[PDB]
Amino acid sequence: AQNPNCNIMIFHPTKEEFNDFDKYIAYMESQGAHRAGLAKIIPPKEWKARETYDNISEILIATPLQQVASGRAGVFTQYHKKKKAMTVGEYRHLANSKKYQTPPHQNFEDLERKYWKNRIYNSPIYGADISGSLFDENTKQWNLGHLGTIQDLLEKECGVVIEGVNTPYLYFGMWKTTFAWHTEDMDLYSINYLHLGEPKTWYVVPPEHGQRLERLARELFPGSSRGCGAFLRHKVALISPTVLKENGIPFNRITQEAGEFMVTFPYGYHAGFNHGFNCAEAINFATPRWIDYGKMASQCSCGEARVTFSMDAFVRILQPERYDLWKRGQ
Ligand SMILES: NNC(=O)[C@H](Cc1ccccc1)c1nn[nH]n1
Ligand SMILES: [Cl-]
Ligand code: NA
Ligand code: NI
Ligand SMILES: [Zn+2]
C-alpha cells in the first residue's frame, strides 16, 4: 500500500498534467495521497490564476465574523460574532492595524508557537463563505469555478438527477483567524487555492484515524458531545498539536503559501490558522471514490449545523433513513 504512514504529499504537476483535473486527483490517490487527508499541489510555473490582484478592494464582506474563544489555550471553542459590512480594502487595512497585525516572528514554527500560546486572548475578524471567484474566466486549468459539479458526479455514478448547484467561496483572513476541526459536508473533498497574502497553516488527521479524533473531542468537549452526536459538524472546536500528541492522535501539519493549492480528501479532519492578511478560494467536489464516504457520513440533526440547500439531495438520495431527522434539524 502506498503512503502507509499517511504523510502529507506535495505534487508538482507539469503543464500537461495540469489539463485534466479528475485524472490528476486519481493519480495523486494512486500514490497514496489521500491517506494523509490533505495534499499540496504546486502549479506549473507557466500557470496563473489571474493577471493581478490590484483590483479586488471593492469586494464586499457583508458579514465579517469576530472569532471569540473560550476555554484554555490548547482546548477551546470559538463563536462567531457578526460585525458590520466592510470592503476588502477596509478589511486589509484592519488586518494590518496594530491591534490585528501579525507579530514579529523568526519563522513559521515561531509563529505557530505564538498562535497556540496566545490565540485565545484575541478575537480576530474573518471574512468567510463569500460566494464568488477570483479566477480569470480564461484560466482553463484548475479553475475552481469550472469544475465538474457534485450533482453531475452523483448523476453519472448513480443515475439520479438532482437539484442543486455547487459554486466557489472566498475567504479573507488575518492573523489568528481560525478554522475549527471538521470534515466537509457529506465528507466531500475540498480544494483550496491561496490567491494572495500571508500563509495558512493546516493540521490534518488521516481519514483512517478520524474516529480517534472524534473520541478525543467527545472527552474534551463533554457538554457539546451530549448535545449532539456529530458536534464537530458545528465547526467550533479547536485542539492544539500539543494536546493531540499528548493523547496519541495521529496527525500531520503543513503550511500553504500563496500560489499553492491544497486538497482535502473524504473524511480527512482538518483545522488551521492564517498568518496574516490573505485571500483564499475554496469549493467542495466529488469523485467516484467519494460516494461510499457520502453514504456513511455522520450528520448533525440538532439544529446547529445549518447548511446549503444543495446538501438536501445528497442526504435524500445517499442516506434516506437519516433524511427525515436531518431535515428536521435544518
Ligand atoms: N471547509 N472550510 C474550511 O476548511 C475553511 C477554511 C479554509 C478556507 C479556505 C481555504 C482553505 C481552508 C473554514 N471553515 N471554517 N472557517 N473556515
Ligand atoms: Cl501573538
Ligand atoms: Na506523521
Ligand atoms: Ni474544510
Ligand atoms: Zn449538532
From Swiss-Prot:
Residue positions binding Fe cation: H182, E184, H270
Alphabetized UniProt keyword annotations: ADP-ribosylation, Chromatin regulator, Dioxygenase, Iron, Metal-binding, Nucleus, Oxidoreductase, Transcription, Transcription regulation, Ubl conjugation, Zinc
Necessary cofactors: Fe(2+)
Residues that coordinate or bind Zn(2+): C228, H234, C300, C302
Substrates-to-products reaction catalysed: N(6),N(6),N(6)-trimethyl-L-lysyl(9)-[histone H3] + 2 2-oxoglutarate + 2 O2 = N(6)-methyl-L-lysyl(9)-[histone H3] + 2 formaldehyde + 2 succinate + 2 CO2
Protein family (similarity comment): Belongs to the JHDM3 histone demethylase family.
Summary of the function given for this chain in its UniProt record: Histone demethylase that specifically demethylates 'Lys-9' of histone H3, thereby playing a central role in histone code. Does not demethylate histone H3 'Lys-4', H3 'Lys-27', H3 'Lys-36' nor H4 'Lys-20'. Demethylates both di- and trimethylated H3 'Lys-9' residue, while it has no activity on monomethylated residues. Demethylation of Lys residue generates formaldehyde and succinate.
Protein name per the record: Lysine-specific demethylase 4D
Organism in which the protein naturally occurs: Homo sapiens
Span of the entire protein shown here: 11 to 340 of 523
